[PDB]
Amino acid sequence: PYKCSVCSKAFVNVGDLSKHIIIHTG
Ligand SMILES: [Zn+2]
């Protein structure tokens, strides 16, 4: 599951999510 738990969100997209995690960790 490509969910982004830290911001209580969820994705099924591997690209969008992985791009999201890198900005999450800054
Ligand atoms: Zn997020």
From Swiss-Prot:
Q: Which residues form a coiled coil?
A: none
- List residue spans of C2H2-type Zn fingers: 2-24
Q: Which domain of life is it from?
A: Eukaryota
Q: In which tissues is it expressed?
A: Expressed in germinal center B-cells.
Q: Where in the cell is it found?
A: Nucleus
Q: What does this protein do?
A: Transcription factor that can function as an activator or repressor depending on its binding partners, and by targeting negative regulators of cell cycle progression. Plays a critical role in early lymphocyte development, where it is essential to prevent apoptosis in lymphoid precursors, allowing them to survive in response to IL7 and undergo proper lineage commitment. Has been shown to bind to the promoters of adenovirus major late protein and cyclin D1 and activate transcription. Required for early embryonic development during gastrulation.
Q: Which family does it belong to?
A: Belongs to the krueppel C2H2-type zinc-finger protein family.
Q: Its quaternary structure?
A: Homooligomerizes (via the BTB/POZ domain), multimerization is required for DNA binding. Interacts (via the C-terminal zinc fingers) with GIF1; the interaction results in the recruitment of MYB to the CDKN1A/p21 and CDKN1B promoters and repression of transcription. Interacts with TRAF2, interfering with the binding of UBC13 to TRAF2, and inhibiting TRAF2 E3 ligase activity. Interacts with MYC (via the C-terminal helix-loop-helix motif); the interaction inhibits ZBTB17 transactivation and growth arrest activities and renders it insoluble in the nucleus.
- What's the protein called, per UniProt? Zinc finger and BTB domain-containing protein 17
The organism's taxonomy opens as:
Eukaryota, Metazoa, Chordata, Craniata, Vertebrata
Q: Which residues of the full protein are shown?
A: 585 to 610 of 803
